[PDB]
Scaffold this active site. Sequence first.
Site, PDB file in Angstrom:
ATOM      1  N   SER A  55       4.495   2.678   8.707  1.00  0.00           N
ATOM      2  CA  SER A  55       4.285   1.441   7.956  1.00  0.00           C
ATOM      3  C   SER A  55       5.635   0.848   7.544  1.00  0.00           C
ATOM      4  O   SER A  55       6.479   1.541   6.946  1.00  0.00           O
ATOM      5  CB  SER A  55       3.483   1.713   6.685  1.00  0.00           C
ATOM      6  OG  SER A  55       2.137   1.320   6.852  1.00  0.00           O
TER       7      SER A  55
ATOM      8  N   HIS B  64       0.798  -1.234   0.000  1.00  0.00           N
ATOM      9  CA  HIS B  64       0.000   0.000   0.000  1.00  0.00           C
ATOM     10  C   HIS B  64       0.828   1.281   0.000  1.00  0.00           C
ATOM     11  O   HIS B  64       0.301   2.350  -0.294  1.00  0.00           O
ATOM     12  CB  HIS B  64      -1.023   0.007   1.157  1.00  0.00           C
ATOM     13  CG  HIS B  64      -0.465   0.375   2.505  1.00  0.00           C
ATOM     14  ND1 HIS B  64      -0.186  -0.567   3.475  1.00  0.00           N
ATOM     15  CD2 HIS B  64      -0.249   1.581   3.089  1.00  0.00           C
ATOM     16  CE1 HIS B  64       0.166   0.038   4.596  1.00  0.00           C
ATOM     17  NE2 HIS B  64       0.138   1.342   4.387  1.00  0.00           N
TER      18      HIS B  64
ATOM     19  N   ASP C 238      -0.447  -7.581   1.774  1.00  0.00           N
ATOM     20  CA  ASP C 238       0.011  -6.189   1.734  1.00  0.00           C
ATOM     21  C   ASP C 238       1.535  -6.095   1.768  1.00  0.00           C
ATOM     22  O   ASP C 238       2.118  -5.141   2.311  1.00  0.00           O
ATOM     23  CB  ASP C 238      -0.616  -5.414   2.902  1.00  0.00           C
ATOM     24  CG  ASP C 238      -0.542  -3.903   2.734  1.00  0.00           C
ATOM     25  OD1 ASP C 238      -0.274  -3.392   1.619  1.00  0.00           O
ATOM     26  OD2 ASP C 238      -0.795  -3.204   3.741  1.00  0.00           O
TER      27      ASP C 238
END
Length: 159
Positions: free
Chosen positions: A110, A36, A58
């Site tokens: 992230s 992402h 992901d």
Amino acid sequence: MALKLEADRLFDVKNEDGDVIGHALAMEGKVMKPLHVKGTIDHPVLSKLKFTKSSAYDMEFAQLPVNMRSEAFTYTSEHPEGFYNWHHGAVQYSGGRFTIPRGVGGRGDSGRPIMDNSGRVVAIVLGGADEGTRTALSVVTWNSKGKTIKTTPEGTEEW
């Protein structure tokens, strides 16, 4: 006594104008980063590698150059309940969930790893869901047989 001298394992992923929007990491022979996160890996060698995608988890990954394979984290699938470490401090693991205090995680987090005291990676942060006084993390982990697993709390927002 201690100086934090470590190998080059954690790398920045930047957006078009250069803001750090996440992180990539050298671990178990691969360079991996959340899928992402759309930006480029801030590294002259790593940014030119051919990345394989894994939408179900992901994750996006490539094989580490023969050389860099030594400069990398080790993963561990054993995570007894208790406290763990990450860039912002303590991460609590209880109830099948990793949580941190509310108002701490967000954009840029992230791809950051959660570690144990022996310095092994236990999970990779993807995003979070605030529940009361805490934030429950959406993380990627692997089990004892090396299978990738992904836990995403209700209302998770990707960081």
